[PDB]
Amino acid sequence: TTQNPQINWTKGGQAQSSSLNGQVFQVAVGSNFNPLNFTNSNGENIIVSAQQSKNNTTFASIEATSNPVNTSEAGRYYNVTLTATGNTGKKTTATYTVLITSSQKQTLYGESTISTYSIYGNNVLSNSTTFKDGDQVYVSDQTKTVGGVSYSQVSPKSKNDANSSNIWVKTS
């Protein structure tokens, strides 16, 4: 009830209205995982924090009470339990699940420099933005073809960003 600490979380900087308890997140094989601040497979930053109560916005202490997460192997899942403790010792827990997936990123090779383009309707314009050989990016599932050339939309930030970055490379 209302007097217990409240756990808050943001995904991609946006406050979330659904409770952290019960969430299922994807985390990439090989990643460093902190259960209070981590990046999901699609590049969205997830930050968990707490306040004293529903109505009291003062900092409340929060820590992982159970964190067996191991990112070494894809196809495994782990439950994380977080405990928030108010200044008079009331407690709230949330348990979320982490699925270890393979990387959703792709490596750009191109020649050392990869040129980018912006697309509006059926028009391809040059973009000054360049990637270096070896740079890793998320890639939109939706490609676009202009003049029989295929282009992929990309972002180094997130899969979501890649769908609207209007930074395109030639699909290889």
Residue numbers in the entry: 189 to 298, 301 to 362
Can I see the authors' text?
S-layer proteins (SLPs) are self-assembling, crystalline proteins coating the cell surfaces of many prokaryotes. We determined the atomic resolution structures of all functional domains (I-III from N- to C-termini) present in the three S-layer proteins SlpA_ac, SlpX_ac, and SlpA_amy. The Lactobacillus S-layers are anchored to the cell wall through interaction with teichoic acids (TA), either lipoteichoic acid (LTA) or wall teichoic acid (WTA).
The full-length SlpX_ac shows differences in structure and domain arrangement compared to the SlpA architecture. The middle domain of SlpX, SlpX_ac_II, exhibits a SlpA_I-like domain fold and an additional repeat of the SlpA motif. The four residues observed in the vicinity of phosphates are conserved with the proposed binding motif of YxY….KxxN. These residues are not conserved in the third SlpA-motif, which is present in SlpX_ac_II. However, SlpX_ac_II contains an additional 3rd SlpA motif and an additional loop region, allowing for increased protein flexibility to incorporate into the assembled SlpA-SlpX S-layer. In summary, the atomic structures of Lactobacillus S-layer proteins, SlpA and SlpX, along with the observed differences in their domain organization, enabled us to generate a self-assembly model for SlpA, the main SLP. This model aligns with prior studies and suggests a domain-swapping mechanism that enables the integration of SlpX into the S-layer.
